[PDB]
Amino acid sequence: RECDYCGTDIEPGTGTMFVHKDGATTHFCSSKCENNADLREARNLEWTDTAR
Amino acid sequence: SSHRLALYRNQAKSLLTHGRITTTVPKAKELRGFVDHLIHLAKRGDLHARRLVLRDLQDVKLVRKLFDEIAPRYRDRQGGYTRVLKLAERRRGDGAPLALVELVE
Amino acid sequence: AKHPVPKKKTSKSKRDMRRSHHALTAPNLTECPQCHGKKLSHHICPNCGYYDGRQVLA
Amino acid sequence: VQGFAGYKAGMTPREGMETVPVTVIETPPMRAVALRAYEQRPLTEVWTDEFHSELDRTLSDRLDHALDIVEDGGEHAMNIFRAGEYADVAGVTKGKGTQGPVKRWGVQKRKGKHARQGWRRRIGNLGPWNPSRVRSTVPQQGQTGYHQRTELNKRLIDIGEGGPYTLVKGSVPGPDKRLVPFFRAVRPNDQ
Amino acid sequence: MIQQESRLKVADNSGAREVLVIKVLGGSGRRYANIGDVVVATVKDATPGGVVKKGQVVKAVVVRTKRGVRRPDGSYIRFDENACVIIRDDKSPRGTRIFGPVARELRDKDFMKIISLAPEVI
RNA sequence: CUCGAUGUCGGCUCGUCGCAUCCUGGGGCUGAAGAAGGUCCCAAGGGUUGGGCUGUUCGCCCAUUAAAGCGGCACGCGAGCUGGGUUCAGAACGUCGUGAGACAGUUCGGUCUCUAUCCGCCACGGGCGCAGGAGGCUUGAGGGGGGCUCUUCCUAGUACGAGAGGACCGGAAGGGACGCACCUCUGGUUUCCCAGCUGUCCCUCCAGGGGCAUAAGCUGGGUAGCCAUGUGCGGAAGGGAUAACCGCUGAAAGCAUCUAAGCGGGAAGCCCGCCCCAAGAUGAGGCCUCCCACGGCGUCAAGCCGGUAAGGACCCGGGAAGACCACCCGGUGGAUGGGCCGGGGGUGUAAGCGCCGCGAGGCGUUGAGCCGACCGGUCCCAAUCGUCCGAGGUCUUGACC
């Protein structure tokens, strides 16, 4: 994928994946993805695998 | 905290000026490494390096003085550019086993 | 506000006994490097300057 | 020396099939010093110097098979401990020190409305009025960190030599890496 | 995780909305309701009287907790939310339908029923 | 006994007994088939949950549970909180009183004090001891820790059973509270490590910084150690002596009787076992590995001196070792600190120049720069040189060379 989108990344040959309601999702990564993303609009996201 | 630094600061400062001062055991034991460390930077020697060293010390004269001045007299070794020497006596009322330290020379 | 205070004249005896475990112990000092005399085990002095380097006065 | 033992390697888990965390342990054969027997009279420990080079800087199976390696010349490679086994190890607490009746000993402290009142840590009480002065009961700030700790059901998983070393099933060696580890599988229950 | 009066929504339709957590179901002591687990709470509020109704004595289970669940697969999983499903004494749901995904779990502790109803089980 | 004064309700915490035992095992009983109850004898190990409303305990109610025990110790605990409350003056009502005041009727609010001496408890050092002087290793008498449990499955839906049900017996698995330990995985830390920021003073103008804005001014984040929300693990077998309780062999009662004598059965319980000390248990224990008879003095001079690095120490340098202390490793024939150096980790690509846009900025060089303890090299630095103290080998009896 791309930490869902968070093109950064973090935590070994395992990692981990957060998640939201509605069969929707959020595979995941670092404390730079999280919080931010968990609170607005992905599009606008830069740094990473979006505003790449 | 802000004090740990401050120290290292003025001590690092004063010192380079003389190159061996009189503070107690510890005090010295540290002003070393640090100050020490700093040195190793005068050694690096450049835009950056300087922009640091100063960053703390704050002061052309020196800052430069060392980077150029001493730095060299050291360009060769491997840290240790300081020889922390304990002292014989002790500040009164107190009774603190002060001590002296210099730039190994 | 003296909640707790002794309760029975401490007994000289004991008292002192207490003050007993106390005691000094002369500076372990040694003798000059070449300074010739007795110095603070490990140091130059108003007799030295040496060690290996003349870092002092007199 | 009746047993087998060495020091703490460290911990980490990784792999398996579901995955599982253990701990590494260092120790070839720390030689063989005499051996336990109270024969003809009182016998226990001899010393026919054959040790290191420094050591004078300070100068019936378990024990049995020993005879095997302790007469060989001294040393004795560790590892019967094989594939899937339960020895037991006795670490050394951990210089944790003298602490408040808090962690030292489970207990609830200064509640709320007073769970702060520049108030806090400190036991509740000792003994009643009539009962009698005190008990040797309620612990106290009973220092820790030094205890001769250990445990049980210590299962070893695997081992290999490159350097004689052992992989463990759940670490909790007690003491810290580079620490003094001794193992055994005492009165095992999982047997 | 999830006891006293921590709240959690529905994903099924039982006719609920959210529910307060009384007891962690199992036996004495015990202090925790983690998906798969089964809770002894009630309605904090439920639709316009579907079939349940606000403040209704209840029984529900675990399927969504941001507490993070460590998968024997040294893996890790969690959710943006915390809620579960009602049940018929017979570990049997009511909501005819599901909502947000869930986790293998359930299966492991019985419930298929939802296991599949679920839009997606992670 | 106490008024030259023992601070009183409930709560909190920390608990400790006891058994008439609530849960828990073992039993005999039943109008007990099963299953589940009832009855009573034996056993306290362990254990006996969240809320609610009430100053309360008590108590009723809510959801659990095996269980949700009765009571001791001034209905334990104020020199340990609580301090709501009854129980200071206010002041209120109501209430009696000509009144004044008043009330186990009520209602608002109303100063619980830093320095433990002793005994006592938990802890760590100092002696002196254990009769050569010596470092290393073990025994444990005797103490202390810990023991609980639900549920799920086969046996089996077979015994029983008209049926709806549901076994001893025998065996898997999971989980609950709990405790020991531990960072790997997880999460909380991260007072400067790293990064973004607005206000300001110096900085030289720009840039590039600097304190202060607590003690970091603010925000994002962040090893290593500590630490849970998290990791392992534990409460078992089994051995012996019993409760109650069940039997055998058989008197006295030529017939019966667990019975005095003889022999066995039988418990979460005692003893043992499993961890945790531990001979200062003055009965100072064992054992191995070192050190040899030095001086001169009136004596059973077991008294004064060089010693033996056997050996230890002190001083230095260091430790998840740590208040001090004691305890551990090192002391330049060293890697012990720091230093440097690689390595990892961590911050998100720097200072500069460059190239796009009036500017703001961007894009590049550049996953840059900077890096606090984590893994490991290298004598740059700093553990130089030096002291002190330390044995000699007590008396009797005998067993062997």
Short mmCIF file of all heavy atoms in Angstrom, two decimals, chain D residues 36 45-47 94-95 125 128-131 146 153 172 174 187, chain F residues 73-74 76 80 138 181-182 233-234 273 287-289 321-322:
data_model
loop_
_atom_site.label_atom_id
_atom_site.label_comp_id
_atom_site.label_asym_id
_atom_site.label_seq_id
_atom_site.Cartn_x
_atom_site.Cartn_y
_atom_site.Cartn_z
N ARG D 36 30.53 -33.04 44.77
CA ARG D 36 29.86 -33.27 46.04
C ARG D 36 29.79 -34.72 46.50
O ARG D 36 29.24 -35.58 45.81
CB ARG D 36 28.47 -32.63 46.04
CG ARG D 36 28.50 -31.11 46.17
CD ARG D 36 29.13 -30.66 47.49
NE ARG D 36 29.66 -29.30 47.43
CZ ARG D 36 29.03 -28.21 47.87
NH1 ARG D 36 27.83 -28.31 48.42
NH2 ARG D 36 29.61 -27.02 47.77
N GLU D 45 34.79 -29.84 48.89
CA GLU D 45 35.53 -29.04 47.90
C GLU D 45 37.05 -29.14 48.04
O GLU D 45 37.61 -28.79 49.08
CB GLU D 45 35.11 -27.56 47.99
CG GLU D 45 33.94 -27.28 48.93
CD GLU D 45 34.40 -26.76 50.29
OE1 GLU D 45 35.50 -26.18 50.37
OE2 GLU D 45 33.65 -26.94 51.28
N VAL D 46 37.71 -29.61 46.99
CA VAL D 46 39.17 -29.59 46.92
C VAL D 46 39.62 -28.53 45.92
O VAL D 46 38.80 -27.76 45.42
CB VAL D 46 39.75 -30.96 46.52
CG1 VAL D 46 41.25 -30.85 46.27
CG2 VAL D 46 39.47 -31.99 47.60
N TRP D 47 40.91 -28.50 45.62
CA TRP D 47 41.43 -27.52 44.66
C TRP D 47 42.86 -27.83 44.21
O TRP D 47 43.82 -27.35 44.80
CB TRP D 47 41.33 -26.11 45.23
CG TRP D 47 40.00 -25.81 45.86
CD1 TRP D 47 39.72 -25.73 47.19
CD2 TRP D 47 38.76 -25.56 45.18
NE1 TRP D 47 38.39 -25.45 47.38
CE2 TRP D 47 37.78 -25.33 46.16
CE3 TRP D 47 38.39 -25.50 43.83
CZ2 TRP D 47 36.45 -25.06 45.85
CZ3 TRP D 47 37.07 -25.22 43.52
CH2 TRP D 47 36.12 -25.01 44.52
N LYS D 94 18.05 -6.88 41.09
CA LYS D 94 18.47 -5.74 40.29
C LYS D 94 18.59 -4.49 41.14
O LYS D 94 17.59 -3.94 41.61
CB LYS D 94 17.47 -5.50 39.16
CG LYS D 94 17.03 -6.77 38.48
CD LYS D 94 15.87 -6.50 37.55
CE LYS D 94 15.41 -7.78 36.87
NZ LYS D 94 14.26 -7.53 35.96
N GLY D 95 19.82 -4.03 41.35
CA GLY D 95 20.07 -2.84 42.15
C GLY D 95 18.96 -1.81 41.98
O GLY D 95 19.18 -0.75 41.40
N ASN D 125 -0.94 2.11 58.03
CA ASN D 125 -0.87 1.90 59.46
C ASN D 125 -0.03 0.73 59.92
O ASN D 125 0.54 -0.01 59.11
CB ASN D 125 -2.27 1.80 60.04
CG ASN D 125 -2.73 3.11 60.67
OD1 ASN D 125 -1.98 3.76 61.41
ND2 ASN D 125 -3.97 3.50 60.36
N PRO D 128 -3.03 -1.92 66.14
CA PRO D 128 -4.09 -1.37 66.98
C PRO D 128 -3.59 -0.92 68.36
O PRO D 128 -2.38 -0.84 68.58
CB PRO D 128 -5.07 -2.55 67.14
CG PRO D 128 -4.76 -3.46 66.01
CD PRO D 128 -3.29 -3.32 65.77
N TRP D 129 -4.52 -0.61 69.27
CA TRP D 129 -4.17 -0.12 70.61
C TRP D 129 -3.77 -1.26 71.55
O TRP D 129 -2.62 -1.36 71.98
CB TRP D 129 -5.35 0.66 71.23
CG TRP D 129 -5.92 1.82 70.42
CD1 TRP D 129 -7.07 1.81 69.68
CD2 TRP D 129 -5.39 3.16 70.31
NE1 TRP D 129 -7.28 3.05 69.10
CE2 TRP D 129 -6.26 3.89 69.48
CE3 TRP D 129 -4.26 3.80 70.84
CZ2 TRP D 129 -6.03 5.24 69.15
CZ3 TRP D 129 -4.03 5.14 70.51
CH2 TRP D 129 -4.92 5.84 69.67
N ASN D 130 -4.75 -2.12 71.86
CA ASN D 130 -4.58 -3.21 72.82
C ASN D 130 -3.65 -4.33 72.34
O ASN D 130 -2.78 -4.77 73.09
CB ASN D 130 -5.95 -3.79 73.22
CG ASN D 130 -6.88 -2.75 73.83
OD1 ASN D 130 -7.96 -3.08 74.32
ND2 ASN D 130 -6.47 -1.48 73.80
N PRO D 131 -3.85 -4.80 71.09
CA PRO D 131 -3.03 -5.87 70.52
C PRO D 131 -1.62 -5.94 71.10
O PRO D 131 -1.33 -6.84 71.90
CB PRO D 131 -3.01 -5.51 69.04
CG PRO D 131 -4.37 -4.88 68.80
CD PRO D 131 -4.86 -4.33 70.14
N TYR D 146 18.66 -6.44 44.84
CA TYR D 146 19.78 -7.32 45.16
C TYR D 146 19.36 -8.79 45.32
O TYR D 146 20.20 -9.69 45.33
CB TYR D 146 20.51 -6.84 46.43
CG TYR D 146 20.52 -5.34 46.63
CD1 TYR D 146 20.18 -4.79 47.87
CD2 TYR D 146 20.88 -4.48 45.60
CE1 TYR D 146 20.19 -3.42 48.07
CE2 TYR D 146 20.90 -3.11 45.79
CZ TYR D 146 20.55 -2.58 47.03
OH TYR D 146 20.57 -1.22 47.23
N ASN D 153 9.43 -23.52 35.94
CA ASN D 153 8.95 -23.84 34.60
C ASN D 153 9.77 -23.12 33.54
O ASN D 153 9.22 -22.53 32.60
CB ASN D 153 7.48 -23.46 34.46
CG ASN D 153 7.25 -21.96 34.54
OD1 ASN D 153 6.23 -21.49 35.04
ND2 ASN D 153 8.22 -21.19 34.05
N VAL D 172 12.84 -12.89 31.47
CA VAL D 172 12.74 -12.60 32.90
C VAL D 172 13.87 -13.28 33.68
O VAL D 172 13.63 -13.90 34.72
CB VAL D 172 11.37 -13.01 33.46
CG1 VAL D 172 11.18 -12.42 34.85
CG2 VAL D 172 10.25 -12.55 32.53
N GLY D 174 15.64 -12.11 35.54
CA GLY D 174 15.80 -11.38 36.78
C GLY D 174 16.83 -10.27 36.64
O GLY D 174 16.48 -9.12 36.41
N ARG D 187 12.11 -30.07 39.95
CA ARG D 187 10.79 -30.66 40.10
C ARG D 187 9.86 -30.08 39.06
O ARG D 187 8.93 -29.34 39.39
CB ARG D 187 10.23 -30.40 41.50
CG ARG D 187 10.67 -31.39 42.58
CD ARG D 187 10.02 -31.04 43.92
NE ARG D 187 10.04 -32.14 44.88
CZ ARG D 187 9.40 -32.13 46.04
NH1 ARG D 187 8.68 -31.08 46.40
NH2 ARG D 187 9.47 -33.18 46.85
P C F 73 -12.64 -6.85 71.08
OP1 C F 73 -12.96 -7.18 72.49
OP2 C F 73 -13.72 -6.44 70.15
"O5'" C F 73 -11.50 -5.73 70.99
"C5'" C F 73 -10.33 -5.85 71.79
"C4'" C F 73 -9.07 -5.90 70.94
"O4'" C F 73 -9.17 -6.93 69.92
"C3'" C F 73 -8.76 -4.66 70.12
"O3'" C F 73 -8.31 -3.59 70.96
"C2'" C F 73 -7.68 -5.23 69.20
"O2'" C F 73 -6.43 -5.35 69.83
"C1'" C F 73 -8.26 -6.61 68.89
N1 C F 73 -8.99 -6.65 67.60
C2 C F 73 -8.53 -5.88 66.53
O2 C F 73 -7.53 -5.17 66.67
N3 C F 73 -9.21 -5.93 65.36
C4 C F 73 -10.29 -6.70 65.25
N4 C F 73 -10.92 -6.71 64.07
C5 C F 73 -10.77 -7.50 66.33
C6 C F 73 -10.10 -7.45 67.48
P A F 74 -7.54 -2.32 70.35
OP1 A F 74 -7.19 -2.63 68.94
OP2 A F 74 -6.48 -1.97 71.32
"O5'" A F 74 -8.59 -1.11 70.36
"C5'" A F 74 -9.97 -1.29 70.06
"C4'" A F 74 -10.82 -0.93 71.27
"O4'" A F 74 -9.97 -1.00 72.45
"C3'" A F 74 -11.44 0.47 71.27
"O3'" A F 74 -12.76 0.46 70.72
"C2'" A F 74 -11.51 0.77 72.77
"O2'" A F 74 -12.65 0.20 73.38
"C1'" A F 74 -10.23 0.12 73.28
N9 A F 74 -9.13 1.06 73.15
C8 A F 74 -8.77 1.73 72.01
N7 A F 74 -7.76 2.54 72.19
C5 A F 74 -7.46 2.40 73.52
C6 A F 74 -6.49 3.00 74.33
N6 A F 74 -5.61 3.89 73.87
N1 A F 74 -6.45 2.64 75.63
C2 A F 74 -7.34 1.75 76.08
N3 A F 74 -8.30 1.12 75.41
C4 A F 74 -8.30 1.50 74.13
P G F 76 -12.90 -0.96 66.41
OP1 G F 76 -13.06 0.02 67.51
OP2 G F 76 -13.16 -0.55 65.02
"O5'" G F 76 -11.42 -1.58 66.50
"C5'" G F 76 -10.53 -1.06 67.49
"C4'" G F 76 -9.06 -1.33 67.21
"O4'" G F 76 -8.84 -2.62 66.59
"C3'" G F 76 -8.37 -0.36 66.26
"O3'" G F 76 -8.07 0.80 66.96
"C2'" G F 76 -7.13 -1.16 65.95
"O2'" G F 76 -6.30 -1.26 67.08
"C1'" G F 76 -7.77 -2.50 65.67
N9 G F 76 -8.34 -2.53 64.34
C8 G F 76 -9.68 -2.58 64.03
N7 G F 76 -9.91 -2.59 62.75
C5 G F 76 -8.65 -2.53 62.17
C6 G F 76 -8.27 -2.51 60.81
O6 G F 76 -9.00 -2.53 59.81
N1 G F 76 -6.89 -2.45 60.65
C2 G F 76 -5.99 -2.42 61.69
N2 G F 76 -4.70 -2.37 61.33
N3 G F 76 -6.33 -2.44 62.97
C4 G F 76 -7.67 -2.49 63.14
P G F 80 2.95 10.07 63.33
OP1 G F 80 3.54 9.29 64.44
OP2 G F 80 3.76 11.10 62.63
"O5'" G F 80 2.38 9.03 62.25
"C5'" G F 80 1.14 8.37 62.45
"C4'" G F 80 0.26 8.66 61.26
"O4'" G F 80 -0.16 7.44 60.59
"C3'" G F 80 -1.08 9.31 61.54
"O3'" G F 80 -0.93 10.66 61.90
"C2'" G F 80 -1.64 9.22 60.13
"O2'" G F 80 -1.02 10.14 59.26
"C1'" G F 80 -1.24 7.80 59.75
N9 G F 80 -2.34 6.85 59.87
C8 G F 80 -2.54 5.93 60.88
N7 G F 80 -3.62 5.21 60.72
C5 G F 80 -4.18 5.68 59.54
C6 G F 80 -5.36 5.29 58.87
O6 G F 80 -6.17 4.41 59.20
N1 G F 80 -5.57 6.01 57.70
C2 G F 80 -4.75 7.01 57.24
N2 G F 80 -5.12 7.60 56.09
N3 G F 80 -3.63 7.40 57.86
C4 G F 80 -3.41 6.69 59.01
P U F 138 29.42 -23.04 45.38
OP1 U F 138 28.99 -23.55 44.06
OP2 U F 138 28.80 -21.81 45.94
"O5'" U F 138 29.27 -24.21 46.47
"C5'" U F 138 28.15 -24.27 47.35
"C4'" U F 138 28.31 -25.35 48.41
"O4'" U F 138 29.37 -24.97 49.32
"C3'" U F 138 27.11 -25.56 49.33
"O3'" U F 138 26.16 -26.45 48.77
"C2'" U F 138 27.76 -26.19 50.55
"O2'" U F 138 27.96 -27.58 50.39
"C1'" U F 138 29.10 -25.47 50.62
N1 U F 138 29.04 -24.36 51.60
C2 U F 138 28.98 -24.67 52.95
O2 U F 138 28.98 -25.81 53.36
N3 U F 138 28.93 -23.57 53.79
C4 U F 138 28.92 -22.23 53.43
O4 U F 138 28.87 -21.36 54.29
C5 U F 138 28.98 -22.00 52.00
C6 U F 138 29.04 -23.05 51.16
P A F 181 10.01 -9.25 42.46
OP1 A F 181 11.23 -8.93 43.23
OP2 A F 181 9.02 -8.19 42.17
"O5'" A F 181 10.39 -9.94 41.06
"C5'" A F 181 11.65 -10.58 40.87
"C4'" A F 181 11.80 -11.16 39.48
"O4'" A F 181 10.52 -11.66 39.02
"C3'" A F 181 12.19 -10.20 38.36
"O3'" A F 181 13.58 -9.93 38.36
"C2'" A F 181 11.85 -11.06 37.16
"O2'" A F 181 12.81 -12.08 36.99
"C1'" A F 181 10.52 -11.67 37.61
N9 A F 181 9.32 -10.99 37.10
C8 A F 181 8.34 -10.38 37.83
N7 A F 181 7.38 -9.87 37.10
C5 A F 181 7.74 -10.17 35.80
C6 A F 181 7.14 -9.91 34.55
N6 A F 181 5.99 -9.25 34.41
N1 A F 181 7.77 -10.35 33.44
C2 A F 181 8.92 -11.01 33.58
N3 A F 181 9.58 -11.32 34.69
C4 A F 181 8.94 -10.87 35.78
P C F 182 14.23 -9.02 37.22
OP1 C F 182 15.64 -9.45 37.06
OP2 C F 182 13.94 -7.61 37.53
"O5'" C F 182 13.43 -9.42 35.89
"C5'" C F 182 14.17 -9.74 34.70
"C4'" C F 182 13.40 -9.46 33.42
"O4'" C F 182 11.98 -9.51 33.65
"C3'" C F 182 13.64 -8.10 32.78
"O3'" C F 182 14.71 -8.21 31.84
"C2'" C F 182 12.32 -7.78 32.06
"O2'" C F 182 12.41 -7.92 30.66
"C1'" C F 182 11.33 -8.80 32.62
N1 C F 182 10.16 -8.14 33.24
C2 C F 182 9.41 -7.24 32.48
O2 C F 182 9.73 -7.02 31.31
N3 C F 182 8.34 -6.65 33.07
C4 C F 182 8.04 -6.92 34.35
N4 C F 182 6.98 -6.31 34.89
C5 C F 182 8.81 -7.83 35.13
C6 C F 182 9.85 -8.42 34.54
P C F 233 4.98 -19.24 29.78
OP1 C F 233 5.16 -20.60 29.21
OP2 C F 233 3.71 -18.53 29.54
"O5'" C F 233 5.25 -19.27 31.36
"C5'" C F 233 6.46 -19.80 31.89
"C4'" C F 233 6.64 -19.42 33.35
"O4'" C F 233 6.66 -17.98 33.43
"C3'" C F 233 5.52 -19.86 34.29
"O3'" C F 233 5.77 -21.16 34.85
"C2'" C F 233 5.55 -18.79 35.37
"O2'" C F 233 6.34 -19.18 36.48
"C1'" C F 233 6.18 -17.58 34.69
N1 C F 233 5.21 -16.51 34.48
C2 C F 233 5.31 -15.37 35.27
O2 C F 233 6.20 -15.29 36.11
N3 C F 233 4.42 -14.37 35.08
C4 C F 233 3.47 -14.50 34.15
N4 C F 233 2.61 -13.49 34.01
C5 C F 233 3.36 -15.67 33.34
C6 C F 233 4.25 -16.65 33.54
P G F 234 4.66 -22.32 34.85
OP1 G F 234 5.33 -23.62 34.60
OP2 G F 234 3.55 -21.89 33.98
"O5'" G F 234 4.10 -22.33 36.34
"C5'" G F 234 5.00 -22.62 37.38
"C4'" G F 234 4.85 -21.58 38.46
"O4'" G F 234 4.66 -20.27 37.88
"C3'" G F 234 3.61 -21.76 39.31
"O3'" G F 234 3.83 -22.81 40.25
"C2'" G F 234 3.54 -20.39 39.97
"O2'" G F 234 4.38 -20.32 41.12
"C1'" G F 234 4.04 -19.45 38.86
N9 G F 234 2.97 -18.66 38.23
C8 G F 234 2.70 -18.56 36.89
N7 G F 234 1.68 -17.79 36.62
C5 G F 234 1.24 -17.36 37.87
C6 G F 234 0.17 -16.50 38.22
O6 G F 234 -0.63 -15.95 37.45
N1 G F 234 0.07 -16.32 39.60
C2 G F 234 0.91 -16.89 40.53
N2 G F 234 0.66 -16.60 41.82
N3 G F 234 1.91 -17.69 40.22
C4 G F 234 2.03 -17.88 38.88
P G F 273 10.96 -30.06 52.96
OP1 G F 273 12.42 -30.22 53.12
OP2 G F 273 10.41 -28.80 52.41
"O5'" G F 273 10.40 -31.27 52.06
"C5'" G F 273 11.30 -31.99 51.23
"C4'" G F 273 10.76 -32.10 49.82
"O4'" G F 273 9.33 -32.32 49.87
"C3'" G F 273 10.93 -30.86 48.96
"O3'" G F 273 12.21 -30.87 48.33
"C2'" G F 273 9.82 -31.04 47.93
"O2'" G F 273 10.22 -31.85 46.85
"C1'" G F 273 8.73 -31.74 48.74
N9 G F 273 7.69 -30.83 49.19
C8 G F 273 7.81 -29.79 50.08
N7 G F 273 6.70 -29.16 50.29
C5 G F 273 5.77 -29.82 49.50
C6 G F 273 4.39 -29.58 49.31
O6 G F 273 3.67 -28.71 49.83
N1 G F 273 3.83 -30.49 48.42
C2 G F 273 4.53 -31.50 47.78
N2 G F 273 3.83 -32.29 46.95
N3 G F 273 5.82 -31.73 47.95
C4 G F 273 6.37 -30.85 48.82
P C F 287 36.20 -31.35 57.13
OP1 C F 287 36.42 -32.81 57.18
OP2 C F 287 36.84 -30.47 58.13
"O5'" C F 287 36.61 -30.81 55.68
"C5'" C F 287 36.23 -31.54 54.53
"C4'" C F 287 36.23 -30.66 53.30
"O4'" C F 287 35.52 -29.43 53.57
"C3'" C F 287 37.61 -30.21 52.83
"O3'" C F 287 38.06 -31.07 51.78
"C2'" C F 287 37.39 -28.77 52.35
"O2'" C F 287 37.72 -28.59 50.98
"C1'" C F 287 35.90 -28.53 52.55
N1 C F 287 35.60 -27.16 53.01
C2 C F 287 35.53 -26.11 52.09
O2 C F 287 35.71 -26.34 50.89
N3 C F 287 35.26 -24.87 52.54
C4 C F 287 35.06 -24.66 53.85
N4 C F 287 34.80 -23.41 54.25
C5 C F 287 35.14 -25.72 54.80
C6 C F 287 35.40 -26.95 54.34
P C F 288 39.59 -31.53 51.69
OP1 C F 288 39.63 -32.86 51.03
OP2 C F 288 40.17 -31.36 53.04
"O5'" C F 288 40.25 -30.45 50.71
"C5'" C F 288 39.93 -30.42 49.31
"C4'" C F 288 40.28 -29.09 48.64
"O4'" C F 288 39.41 -28.03 49.10
"C3'" C F 288 41.67 -28.54 48.93
"O3'" C F 288 42.61 -29.14 48.05
"C2'" C F 288 41.52 -27.04 48.65
"O2'" C F 288 41.96 -26.68 47.35
"C1'" C F 288 40.02 -26.79 48.79
N1 C F 288 39.70 -25.81 49.86
C2 C F 288 39.46 -24.47 49.52
O2 C F 288 39.52 -24.13 48.34
N3 C F 288 39.18 -23.59 50.51
C4 C F 288 39.13 -24.00 51.78
N4 C F 288 38.84 -23.09 52.72
C5 C F 288 39.37 -25.36 52.14
C6 C F 288 39.65 -26.22 51.16
P U F 289 43.97 -28.36 47.73
OP1 U F 289 44.75 -29.19 46.79
OP2 U F 289 44.57 -27.93 49.01
"O5'" U F 289 43.47 -27.05 46.96
"C5'" U F 289 44.30 -26.47 45.98
"C4'" U F 289 44.61 -25.03 46.35
"O4'" U F 289 43.40 -24.43 46.88
"C3'" U F 289 45.64 -24.85 47.45
"O3'" U F 289 46.96 -24.94 46.91
"C2'" U F 289 45.29 -23.44 47.91
"O2'" U F 289 45.77 -22.46 47.01
"C1'" U F 289 43.76 -23.47 47.87
N1 U F 289 43.11 -23.86 49.16
C2 U F 289 42.70 -22.87 50.03
O2 U F 289 42.84 -21.68 49.81
N3 U F 289 42.11 -23.33 51.19
C4 U F 289 41.90 -24.65 51.55
O4 U F 289 41.36 -24.91 52.63
C5 U F 289 42.35 -25.61 50.59
C6 U F 289 42.93 -25.19 49.45
P A F 321 22.33 -3.04 41.07
OP1 A F 321 22.06 -4.13 40.12
OP2 A F 321 21.29 -2.62 42.05
"O5'" A F 321 23.68 -3.36 41.88
"C5'" A F 321 23.65 -3.73 43.26
"C4'" A F 321 24.32 -2.67 44.14
"O4'" A F 321 25.69 -2.44 43.74
"C3'" A F 321 23.71 -1.29 44.05
"O3'" A F 321 22.52 -1.25 44.81
"C2'" A F 321 24.82 -0.43 44.65
"O2'" A F 321 24.89 -0.51 46.06
"C1'" A F 321 26.05 -1.08 44.02
N9 A F 321 26.44 -0.42 42.78
C8 A F 321 26.95 -0.99 41.64
N7 A F 321 27.20 -0.14 40.68
C5 A F 321 26.83 1.08 41.21
C6 A F 321 26.84 2.38 40.69
N6 A F 321 27.28 2.67 39.45
N1 A F 321 26.39 3.37 41.49
C2 A F 321 25.96 3.07 42.72
N3 A F 321 25.90 1.89 43.32
C4 A F 321 26.35 0.92 42.50
P G F 322 21.23 -0.52 44.22
OP1 G F 322 20.22 -1.55 43.91
OP2 G F 322 21.66 0.43 43.16
"O5'" G F 322 20.77 0.34 45.49
"C5'" G F 322 21.29 0.01 46.78
"C4'" G F 322 22.62 0.69 47.04
"O4'" G F 322 23.40 0.76 45.82
"C3'" G F 322 22.50 2.13 47.50
"O3'" G F 322 22.30 2.16 48.91
"C2'" G F 322 23.88 2.67 47.13
"O2'" G F 322 24.82 2.36 48.13
"C1'" G F 322 24.23 1.90 45.86
N9 G F 322 24.06 2.63 44.60
C8 G F 322 23.50 2.13 43.45
N7 G F 322 23.46 2.99 42.47
C5 G F 322 24.04 4.14 42.99
C6 G F 322 24.27 5.40 42.39
O6 G F 322 24.00 5.75 41.23
N1 G F 322 24.88 6.29 43.27
C2 G F 322 25.22 6.00 44.57
N2 G F 322 25.80 6.99 45.28
N3 G F 322 25.01 4.82 45.15
C4 G F 322 24.42 3.94 44.31
#
